[PDB]
């Protein structure tokens, strides 16, 4: 596993999240559950707890955007960059942006929202990319991951535990 440099991490165990806007691609129920399933994956192997907010600035702000969106890292249209997230911290740190030029499905085939979200949240937690090919955090997880058999790898686990005990 790898972490970000200087090892940023959350300094509290109770974190909030807010889903700002929705993707045309799916029903809202479907996005709520993708996200919620993704946070729970992580919540099961760390002493952290996530609670949803409907207003205010939540620690982890989740939104859908295209091209330029208020940070230095413009989306790039269909394909390539799918999403981006920031290491733990205040303001924009911990936030996750999803490329709405992508076609978000609940499928085994296509860009799966649950899987991308699960990977992006590892970054919001303080994990960087892994060399282990079976890891959720390896860069090509999006293509090699068989959703039927979905589980955190031991690498994933050893990494988040080295941060949160
Ligand atoms: O690779 C990162 C880092 C992110 N930038 C960040 O977290 O800077 C804060 C920071 C920096 C250093 C130490 C502590 C905090 C970023 C965001 C946008 C573009 C490039 C990088 N994000 C990823 N999201 N999805 C991935 S796949 S990679
Ligand atoms: Ca934030
Ligand atoms: Ca893209
Ligand atoms: Ca879309
Ligand atoms: Zn507290
Ligand atoms: Zn962004
Ligand atoms: Zn990544």
XYZ file of C-alpha atoms and ligand atoms in Angstrom:
199
model
C 0.000 0.000 0.000
C 1.046 3.640 -0.140
C -0.238 6.767 1.592
C 0.104 10.391 0.549
C 3.355 12.121 1.517
C 3.641 13.601 4.994
C 0.810 11.191 5.718
C -2.285 13.364 5.889
C -5.120 11.851 7.909
C -8.400 12.813 9.574
C -7.959 14.011 13.176
C -11.445 12.941 14.306
C -13.308 9.639 13.988
C -16.811 10.966 13.257
C -16.951 12.354 9.689
C -19.845 13.813 7.660
C -20.544 13.624 3.897
C -22.973 15.480 1.632
C -23.962 14.542 -1.947
C -24.291 17.941 -3.604
C -25.923 17.265 -6.966
C -26.920 14.172 -8.953
C -25.948 12.608 -12.257
C -28.566 12.365 -15.012
C -27.264 8.836 -15.618
C -29.037 7.104 -12.733
C -31.983 7.367 -10.371
C -31.138 9.185 -7.115
C -31.828 6.020 -5.099
C -29.124 4.286 -7.096
C -26.554 7.015 -6.420
C -27.447 7.181 -2.702
C -26.827 3.465 -2.356
C -23.609 3.367 -4.406
C -22.104 6.053 -2.191
C -23.489 4.617 1.044
C -22.235 1.145 0.176
C -18.832 2.664 -0.588
C -18.476 4.432 2.768
C -19.562 1.321 4.666
C -16.868 -0.776 2.970
C -14.404 1.595 4.622
C -16.288 2.026 7.888
C -16.122 -1.712 8.530
C -12.293 -1.779 8.709
C -11.594 1.500 10.537
C -12.799 3.083 13.747
C -14.374 5.900 11.597
C -18.067 6.703 11.326
C -19.829 8.590 8.535
C -23.048 10.597 8.898
C -24.896 12.377 6.093
C -25.679 16.098 6.016
C -28.187 17.787 3.675
C -26.932 21.318 4.047
C -23.756 22.981 5.212
C -20.171 22.110 4.342
C -19.684 18.427 5.175
C -16.171 17.078 5.609
C -16.528 14.983 2.487
C -18.397 16.943 -0.193
C -19.403 14.769 -3.167
C -20.435 16.322 -6.497
C -20.760 15.605 -10.238
C -19.173 18.001 -12.746
C -17.753 18.324 -16.267
C -14.629 20.073 -17.541
C -13.818 23.088 -15.287
C -15.453 23.000 -11.895
C -13.767 25.205 -9.342
C -10.360 23.587 -8.675
C -7.138 23.367 -10.710
C -8.051 20.036 -12.253
C -10.559 20.283 -15.076
C -12.505 17.220 -16.074
C -11.453 15.941 -19.487
C -14.594 14.745 -21.315
C -15.523 11.141 -22.081
C -12.964 8.614 -20.869
C -9.527 9.082 -19.322
C -9.944 10.779 -15.939
C -13.143 9.420 -14.391
C -12.903 11.090 -10.969
C -10.672 12.799 -8.431
C -10.383 13.148 -4.695
C -8.328 15.000 -2.123
C -6.399 13.708 0.908
C -7.846 14.357 4.381
C -7.896 18.021 5.508
C -10.233 21.033 5.609
C -11.967 22.886 2.825
C -11.584 20.930 -0.446
C -9.440 18.233 1.196
C -11.426 15.004 1.513
C -13.813 16.008 -1.343
C -14.671 13.722 -4.271
C -15.624 14.991 -7.778
C -17.073 12.618 -10.432
C -16.717 13.264 -14.176
C -20.289 13.607 -15.420
C -19.037 13.176 -19.008
C -18.715 9.538 -17.997
C -21.600 7.096 -18.235
C -22.341 6.032 -14.663
C -24.028 2.633 -14.369
C -24.761 0.097 -11.612
C -23.128 -2.465 -13.870
C -20.450 -5.048 -14.146
C -19.897 -3.559 -17.590
C -19.202 0.170 -17.904
C -18.026 2.779 -15.384
C -19.480 1.496 -12.132
C -20.335 4.212 -9.610
C -20.037 1.976 -6.513
C -16.517 0.832 -7.494
C -15.181 4.279 -8.483
C -16.665 5.778 -5.309
C -15.088 3.015 -3.138
C -11.690 3.791 -4.700
C -12.047 7.585 -4.499
C -12.979 7.366 -0.759
C -9.784 5.438 -0.071
C -8.038 8.607 -1.328
C -10.256 10.795 0.861
C -9.159 8.593 3.750
C -5.429 9.030 3.035
C -4.421 6.059 0.908
C -2.551 6.525 -2.379
C -2.049 3.949 -5.158
C -0.952 0.388 -4.508
C 1.303 -1.926 -6.496
C -0.663 -5.017 -5.381
C -2.714 -5.976 -8.452
C -5.666 -7.269 -6.377
C -6.019 -4.063 -4.327
C -9.004 -1.739 -4.592
C -6.329 1.013 -4.626
C -4.250 -0.347 -7.555
C -4.800 2.089 -10.471
C -6.553 -0.397 -12.813
C -9.051 -1.598 -10.191
C -11.838 -0.266 -12.448
C -11.104 -2.886 -15.127
C -9.873 -5.872 -13.120
C -12.509 -5.835 -10.379
C -15.215 -8.480 -10.493
C -18.122 -6.942 -8.603
C -19.705 -10.325 -7.924
C -16.682 -11.206 -5.815
C -16.080 -7.768 -4.316
C -13.904 -7.505 -1.224
C -11.191 -5.274 0.247
C -7.775 -6.862 -0.352
C -5.402 -7.477 2.562
C -3.243 -4.671 1.161
C -6.153 -2.246 1.327
C -6.755 -3.328 4.886
C -3.129 -3.198 6.005
C -2.877 0.313 4.576
C -5.983 1.852 6.225
C -5.076 0.198 9.559
C -1.576 1.688 9.465
C -3.384 5.011 9.568
C -6.361 4.364 11.793
C -5.444 1.404 14.037
O -3.783 11.834 -6.437
C -4.690 12.655 -5.780
C -4.232 13.836 -4.915
C -5.196 15.020 -5.135
N -4.582 16.146 -4.453
C -4.516 16.244 -3.107
O -5.058 15.407 -2.360
O -3.767 17.339 -2.645
C -3.902 17.491 -1.269
C -2.720 16.880 -0.594
C -1.551 16.716 -1.251
C -0.466 16.166 -0.601
C -0.550 15.814 0.715
C -1.730 16.030 1.383
C -2.812 16.560 0.719
C -5.399 15.327 -6.575
C -6.572 15.897 -6.989
C -6.751 16.279 -8.286
C -5.780 16.021 -9.202
C -4.587 15.505 -8.803
C -4.393 15.170 -7.500
N -6.047 12.441 -5.902
C -6.695 11.407 -6.665
N -7.956 11.253 -6.790
N -8.234 10.139 -7.569
C -7.168 9.507 -8.073
S -7.318 8.041 -9.080
S -5.692 10.259 -7.553
Ca -13.684 18.723 2.643
Ca -13.255 11.881 -18.362
Ca -22.944 11.209 -17.474
Zn -15.438 15.023 17.963
Zn -12.397 18.489 -9.013
Zn -6.773 6.478 -7.518
